[PDB]
Write an enzyme that holds these catalytic residues in place. Structure first.
Site, short mmCIF file in Angstrom:
data_model
loop_
_atom_site.label_atom_id
_atom_site.label_comp_id
_atom_site.label_asym_id
_atom_site.label_seq_id
_atom_site.Cartn_x
_atom_site.Cartn_y
_atom_site.Cartn_z
N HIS A 28 -1.85 1.24 6.86
CA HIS A 28 -2.41 1.30 5.48
C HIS A 28 -2.50 2.75 5.02
O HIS A 28 -2.58 3.69 5.86
CB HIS A 28 -3.76 0.56 5.40
CG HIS A 28 -4.18 0.24 4.01
ND1 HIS A 28 -3.50 -0.68 3.20
CD2 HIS A 28 -5.20 0.73 3.27
CE1 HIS A 28 -4.11 -0.75 2.04
NE2 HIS A 28 -5.16 0.11 2.05
N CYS A 57 0.86 -1.21 0.00
CA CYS A 57 0.00 0.00 0.00
C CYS A 57 0.90 1.26 0.00
O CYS A 57 0.68 2.12 -0.83
CB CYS A 57 -1.03 -0.10 1.12
SG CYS A 57 -0.31 0.10 2.76
N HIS A 106 -5.74 2.51 -4.00
CA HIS A 106 -4.77 1.91 -3.06
C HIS A 106 -4.42 0.50 -3.53
O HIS A 106 -5.20 -0.10 -4.28
CB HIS A 106 -5.25 1.91 -1.60
CG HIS A 106 -6.51 1.16 -1.35
ND1 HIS A 106 -6.68 0.35 -0.24
CD2 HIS A 106 -7.64 1.04 -2.07
CE1 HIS A 106 -7.88 -0.19 -0.27
NE2 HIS A 106 -8.49 0.21 -1.38
#
Length: 127
Positions: free
Chosen positions: A85, A30, A97
């Site tokens: 994240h 990510c 993402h």
């Protein structure tokens, strides 16, 4: 138009697979995705890992998110509240993402969805 370059470049990578520790050009995690997109679109250098990207650039309130802002999340259960994240805000709650969820690929998800909303930590403006 920095943000237009970030988002349009990021969309070319839709469907590219999630691989922990990868930062492009073929696979991503990510934070490797956000680093690679920022570097390749507009030549902005951000930190490698999500927790460090979360401390970089201008703090943004969740109500003031703009296209190209980085949005940060924690992990569900017992934790620190540690950022784990990151996605690139596009608009209308949408972020792009590298999802380690069921899809295991660069995808689009909504920060207002039940899953992401409770895990939202902070945001940063790097453009």
């Amino acid at each position: 138009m920095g943000a237009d370059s970030v988002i349009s470049f990021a969309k070319t990578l839709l469907g590219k697979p999630y691989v922990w520790g990868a930062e492009g050009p073929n696979s991503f995690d990510c934070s490797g995705f956000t680093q690679y997109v920022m570097k390749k679109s507009v030549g902005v250098s951000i930190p490698r890992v999500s927790r460090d990207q979360s401390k970089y650039g201008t703090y943004v309130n969740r109500g003031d998110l703009r296209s190209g802002d980085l949005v940060f999340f924690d992990t569900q259960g017992s934790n620190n509240g540690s950022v784990s994240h990151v996605g690139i805000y596009i608009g209308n709650g949408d972020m792009i993402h590298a999802s380690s969820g069921s899809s295991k690929k660069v995808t689009i998800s909504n920060i207002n969805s039940s899953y992401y909303s409770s895990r939202y930590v902070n945001a940063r403006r790097v453009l």
